[PDB]
UniProtKB/Swiss-Prot annotation, chain A:
One of its GO terms (molecular function) is structural constituent of ribosome. GO terms for cellular component: cytosol; cytosolic large ribosomal subunit. This is Large ribosomal subunit protein eL20A. The keyword Metal-binding does not apply. Present with 54300 molecules/cell in log phase SD medium. There are 2 genes for eL20 in yeast. It comes from the Eukaryota. HAMAP family: Ribosomal_eL20. Belongs to the eukaryotic ribosomal protein eL20 family. Transmembrane segments: none annotated.
From Swiss-Prot, chain B:
It is found in: Nucleus, Nucleolus; Cytoplasm. Keywords: Cytoplasm, Nucleus, Ribosome biogenesis. Belongs to the universal ribosomal protein uL10 family. This is Ribosome assembly factor MRT4. Gene3D superfamilies: 3.30.70.1730, 3.90.105.20. The gene is MRT4. Component of the ribosome assembly machinery. Nuclear paralog of the ribosomal protein P0, it binds pre-60S subunits at an early stage of assembly in the nucleolus, and is replaced by P0 in cytoplasmic pre-60S subunits and mature 80S ribosomes. Associates with the pre-60S ribosomal particle. InterPro entries: Mrt4, Ribosomal_uL10, Ribosomal_uL10-like_insert, Ribosomal_uL10-like_insert_sf, Ribosomal_uL10-like_sf, Ribosome_Assembly_uL10. One of its GO terms (molecular function) is large ribosomal subunit rRNA binding. Its main location: nucleus.
UniProtKB/Swiss-Prot annotation, chain C:
Pfam families: Ribosomal_L6. This is Large ribosomal subunit protein uL6A. The keyword Nucleotide-binding does not apply. Belongs to the universal ribosomal protein uL6 family. It comes from Saccharomyces cerevisiae (strain ATCC 204508 / S288c) (Baker's yeast). Component of the ribosome, a large ribonucleoprotein complex responsible for the synthesis of proteins in the cell. The small ribosomal subunit (SSU) binds messenger RNAs (mRNAs) and translates the encoded message by selecting cognate aminoacyl-transfer RNA (tRNA) molecules. The large subunit (LSU) contains the ribosomal catalytic site termed the peptidyl transferase center (PTC), which catalyzes the formation of peptide bonds, thereby polymerizing the amino acids delivered by tRNAs into a polypeptide chain. GO terms for cellular component: cytosol; cytosolic large ribosomal subunit. It is found in: Cytoplasm. InterPro entries: Ribosomal_uL6-like (IPR000702), Ribosomal_uL6-like_a/b-dom_sf (IPR036789), Ribosomal_uL6_a/b-dom (IPR020040), Ribosomal_uL6_CS2 (IPR002359).
Length: 170, 227, 188
RNA sequence: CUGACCGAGUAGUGUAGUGGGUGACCAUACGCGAAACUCAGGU
RNA sequence: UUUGCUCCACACAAUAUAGAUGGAUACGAAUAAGGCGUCCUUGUGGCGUCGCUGAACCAUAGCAGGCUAGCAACGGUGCACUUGGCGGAAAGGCCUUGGGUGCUUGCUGGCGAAUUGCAAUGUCAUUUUGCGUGGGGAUAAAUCAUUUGUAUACGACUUAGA
RNA sequence: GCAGUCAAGCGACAUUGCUAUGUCGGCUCUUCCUAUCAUACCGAAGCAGAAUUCGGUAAGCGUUGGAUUGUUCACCCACUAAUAGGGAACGUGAGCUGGGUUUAGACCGUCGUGAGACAGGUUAGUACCCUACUGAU
RNA sequence: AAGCUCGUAUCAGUUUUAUGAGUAAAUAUGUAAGAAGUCCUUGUUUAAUUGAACGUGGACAUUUGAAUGAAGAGCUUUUAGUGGGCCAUUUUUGGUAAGAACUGGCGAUGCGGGAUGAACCGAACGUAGAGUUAAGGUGCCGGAAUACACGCUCAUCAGACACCACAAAAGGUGUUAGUUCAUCUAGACAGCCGGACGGUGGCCAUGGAAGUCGGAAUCCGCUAAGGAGUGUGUAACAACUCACCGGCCGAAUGAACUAGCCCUGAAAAUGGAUGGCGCUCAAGCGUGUUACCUAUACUCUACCGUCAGGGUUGGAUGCCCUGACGAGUAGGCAGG
RNA sequence: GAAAUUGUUGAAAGGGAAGGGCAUUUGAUCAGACAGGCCAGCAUCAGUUUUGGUGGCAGGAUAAAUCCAUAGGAAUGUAGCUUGCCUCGGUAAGUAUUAUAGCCUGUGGGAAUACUGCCAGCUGGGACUGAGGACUGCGACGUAAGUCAAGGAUGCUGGCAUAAUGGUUAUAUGCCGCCCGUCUUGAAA
């Protein structure tokens, strides 16, 4: 269900006069190992002259979050291919982990820009330990000290189809 | 999409930008050492011709004006950051629209000239009353036989802004009763000041004032305050 | 960006006091009282020191922020009217036909009567709204003053007075006869 | 006149979508995949 | 018309059910606010309390709910009367004085269940209609024919004649 | 349109000289559209008045009588606030009119040796069934 | 349809190995992957059995010459219907808006979905029982969650699922998110007020034209700044006011560009249709995560029939076991 | 002495069509057999299938974490202190890296849980099917005799013995269904 992070390394299978290539690696976000390997191959074929037939995955390992329970301001750089020419996009997402940040980013791109998974390229994701460098207001507002806000217009759910109390909110 | 539109026009002049302020800062810094005496004047409101006449009413000297904060930066707003000996104190006294007259003739002479320099000024005074009939260009302050009736073009200005209940039948501007514009010895309101300025009643007078002086050899602020 | 919370400060002078319940709002002071039904705006009020009141909107958009700001403006206008009051001076001028303005108690409603507008035989009656005092200016020719605690009522009456004398089928550049406002200052 | 992680995994092309786009066209996944060209050498 | 209609009581049938198998349990307004108790110098007042569902309230034990003996209360409640009321939006319903008659599982006892044989919905209500008994109330209309036309192709319509 | 002109984007706006081969038409009838001729209400126009131009919503109503075309082409007189444009098989043959188109006879011009044909002009010609609607048991 | 000769049979609408064919790919197109093959030796046109050719002796039988699959291969007789089909995909041509070459469908086709459809998505059909799915849906009609989670919409003809009967550029001071400049706590923008100067009422035309009815121009002196003056303007002036500068106001603001939703762009005639009801933190849009409804499809089983492989000397065309399958117009055969 | 068509009697339905198909309720009608015919329940079973509980393991950075010990750093600055008036216990800005909160980073330490796959591990409930018809065979439990969930259901019980189940049909309702033949690339036209 949730996105997974895998470290994928390609070998570019060696031959005589071409021994032990540099073993290029990448960080890939995918739901499963197969999709991660497919995305790694797609990126590698574009980056330099390599192919699945003439290459292999050295090793794939899931990158578990170092601190799964910690609020972080993740800086996001994304290249998305719209109907017109593609352009760069920088976003910040306050999330608990890289996986959650990427999952929220995918939904945000799909909604606010109609950018599908095929058209989304993850340039880089970096945790922002500093506070003065945050540039996005919608994430900055949440950094105020002793922040407290209400939940007006609370709506409850009813199991029975008929209610006699005529309920209210809060 | 809803944002305020700009009424900018293709004028023949553009903003000077930050370069002018930086240049003036360096000019002030150089003048601080070029000349002997320095002063911190107050010229919150003065007509340009008055300043031009001042700039040529004395021998070779430099009258330096500029942004208040720029002048403070040139002088320095802290004792540790002061450019010269105790120059921070001189900057501390700069409150309004200040200017510096860099000259070396005599400390007493400069203050005496400031005291004796007086010229006509607007209200920004004695009470005045408009004539009960046709209003003249000077608002009755001179004989009607010499003045000329006010131009009808400015009647909308009189009605909408000056609050005077003017009417135009036989469109030479006329009023139904005498109108009191200013009282005795009071700071006139913006509307009253504009009314007096339009009538050309420059009853007030302006005299240059200085808060303090400085000398390159005294190494301290000459805390002399005259108006 | 759906601000988490935005608010504006309302300054209440010591003389007047305001008691706030569900969005029906009441203002009381030396010049009487005023009320308004703000239930359509969906804003929240809060007491600070009985001298300043904050209106806060949580998770409100740009339209909600504008609604909050106009609520603050309306509250300030109500406070000013209760404290100072408004004096909408109106003037009427004519070229040939002297316009006659009078107050008549026709139907017990204190209708304003206008006659001889450009020689028209029709006589228009403008219903005077509640809480807007009307008095003819003294020693000022062809001037009428409209005053009242509520800005809305006084402004509406002033607009109606000028709208009745609307020139029809004639060149507005020549027929200067009409009713117009001349001032919008406070009674104080 | 030969080699090359050199053009370049670019152009081009088979297969699939109830993929996007009114249209022109475009992207994805399973594959194939060049030449002119570049460096050096040859003559 | 030799006793028809209608109402009430009592007895068998048919006739079915858009579908019982404890109770359709009654303020109003808002949801960027409310219900309840309390207090005051009664208001858009102060205090405490509650929601986060009815997963509640009432009621619920006896051969589909028998026959009998006492205790303590004088309450609970079905039935027919009875006194004073309210309800017209489709009122046909909602209040209450007075006793009478029961049951009372509020509390404690005496006898009976069997064999429907290991379950077979195991029949326990409401809508209509007629004949079989007793008691209450009164003894009319329309159509056809004719007839005048405010009417009409014919119907129909407007009228009159014991 | 032809042949140019400069240039924000990847060629918009502006810019230079001249420049009938078909049959549909008319009397009555009902309805619909606005791209508004007239009427209601308004804004801008050298609206001083009067008169007039354009523009905005608005289809309720009104949008004619005649010289005259068979006519498809389509022009004039007069009244009226005006005499606006269209659709319903460019509605309306078991509604009418056959007006025009189109059989069998016949006259004039061309060709064709001939019979005949036209590039052509003229003449004379064959609901009582169901439903809907209006009334009515 | 009738069959005939052989039988493990050579084959394949498929791939791999080798290479022709192409400045030049890809898809395809050609040949081979050998027992009917290879090798040593030797018999019966060259000067010479030198060599071709067909024989004998000898060497290898099947990891015997790649992968995968094969209700077998070849052969003979005869004939019922069509010889004009239509739709869709690729390539080429033509083209403001059809002609040749390819393959799959309908015609001959049921069943579920798109409210229905000949060209679409699934899936091809014996009669029955149970379960799981396909496309399509989970507000009601309508069997399934007013499912969960993240963002957008106020539309006075919104929106609501490819073929389907379809418009954009462009405009909007509607709304959401991004890219780059430009000024910023020695003071960004809004707002307040003050300055906005002298030569010069610059040269021409003038009756007036002085910053403004006009022509060419557009500089000097001082500034923090001030344009021989951006406009309003009185017959000229003047005055007002714009650019610009000074202060108070005290934290981001301003310009252009990009792409998510909405309106215009997308104007007719009987009254009308996302299918209707109908909906707005949607029951609309993009995307993610789960459980749910089912076709004559798939999985398990009962039965009729067709076909195939075996058993049967004690009703033989007979009886028993096993396995696969059941579409269909013209038409053929067989059994009734 | 047939159908098309018509009348009388009995039954049934009928709100702008009828007729037909799968499916059941109601009305009518109807055949059969009982030292063993029709309809069901329970127990354990062979096959298919659906939904729960629960236990042991195989991998992750021998999961990541959390937690613990250690060194360091920081503010959306904890205590304390200085300034400020003072709502005399207030909070505004300076200092202050744990003090009268704690947070983060690197290292090291002992565990589980999450995800994933396996179990020729156990077990509850629901639905359909009972096909074959004396043995022969493959297997398991037993020292053996024998037994068994091992090449297709047995054991017990109850009601009815009839219109009770069931068939035919009249008609009630859930859904669907266009008018037959020929021709046409295509028809209901």
């Amino acid at each position: 269900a949730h996105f997974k992070e895998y470290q994928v390394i390609g070998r570019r299978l060696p031959t005589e006069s071409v021994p032990e290539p540099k073993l290029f690696r990448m960080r890939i976000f995918a739901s499963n190992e197969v999709i991660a390997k497919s995305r790694y191959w797609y990126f590698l074929q574009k980056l330099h002259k390599v192919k699945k037939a003439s290459g292999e995955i050295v090793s794939i390992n899931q990158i578990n979050e170092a601190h799964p329970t910690k609020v972080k301001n993740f800086g996001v750089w994304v290249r998305y291919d719209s109907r017109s020419g593609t352009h760069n996009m920088y976003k910040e997402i306050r999330d608990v982990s890289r996986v959650a940040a990427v999952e929220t980013l995918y939904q945000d791109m799909a909604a606010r820009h109609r950018a599908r998974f095929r058209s989304i390229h993850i340039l880089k994701v970096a945790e922002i330990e500093k506070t003065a460098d945050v540039k996005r207001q919608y994430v900055k507002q949440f950094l105020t000290k002793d922040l407290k806000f209400p939940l007006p217009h609370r709506v409850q759910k009813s199991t029975k189809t008929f209610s006699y109390k005529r309920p209210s909110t809060f | 999409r809803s944002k305020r539109s700009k009424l900018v026009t293709l004028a023949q002049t553009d903003k000077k930008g930050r370069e002018n302020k930086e240049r003036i800062f360096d000019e002030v810094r150089e003048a601080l050492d070029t000349y002997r005496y320095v002063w911190v004047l107050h010229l919150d409101d003065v007509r340009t011709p008055v300043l031009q006449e001042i700039r040529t009413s004395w021998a070779g000297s430099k009258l330096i004006m500029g942004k208040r904060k720029v002048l403070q930066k040139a002088l320095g707003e802290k004792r540790e950051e002061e450019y010269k000996e105790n120059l921070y104190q001189l900057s501390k006294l700069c409150s309004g629209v200040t200017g510096l007259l860099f000259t070396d003739e005599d400390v007493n002479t400069v203050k005496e000239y400031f005291k004796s320099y007086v010229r006509s000024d607007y209200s920004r005074p004695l009470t005045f009353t408009i004539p009960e009939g046709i209003v003249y260009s000077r608002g009755g302050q001179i004989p009607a036989e010499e003045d000329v009736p006010m131009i009808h073009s400015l009647e909308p200005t009189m009605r909408n802004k000056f609050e005077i209940p003017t009417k135009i039948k036989a469109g030479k501007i006329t009023i139904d009763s005498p109108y009191l514009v200013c009282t005795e010895g009071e700071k006139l309101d913006v509307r009253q000041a504009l009314i007096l300025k339009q009538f050309g009643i420059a009853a007030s007078e302006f005299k240059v004032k200085v808060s303090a002086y400085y000398d390159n050899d005294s190494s301290t602020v000459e805390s002399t305050n005259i108006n | 960006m759906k601000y988490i919370q935005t608010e504006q400060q309302i300054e209440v002078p010591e003389g007047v006091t305001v008691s706030i319940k569900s969005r029906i709002v009441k203002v009381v002071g030396p010049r009487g009282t005023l009320t308004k039904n703000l239930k359509h705006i969906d804003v929240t009020f809060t007491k600070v020191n009985n001298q300043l009141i904050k209106v806060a909107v949580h998770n409100g958009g740009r339209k909600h922020v504008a609604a909050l700001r106009t609520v603050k403006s309306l509250v300030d206008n109500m406070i000013t009217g209760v404290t100072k009051g408004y004096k909408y001076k109106m003037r009427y001028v004519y070229a040939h036909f002297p316009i006659n303005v009078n107050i008549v108690e026709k139907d017990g409603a204190k209708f304003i009567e206008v006659r001889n507008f450009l020689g028209d035989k029709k006589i228009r009656n403008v219903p005077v709204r509640d809480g807007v005092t009307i008095e003819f200016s003294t020693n000022v020719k062809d001037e009428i003053v409209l005053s009242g605690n509520s800005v809305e009522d006084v402004s509406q009456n002033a607009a109606d007075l000028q709208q009745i004398c609307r020139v029809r089928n004639k060149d507005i550049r020549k027929f200067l006869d009409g009713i117009y406002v001349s001032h919008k200052g406070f009674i104080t």
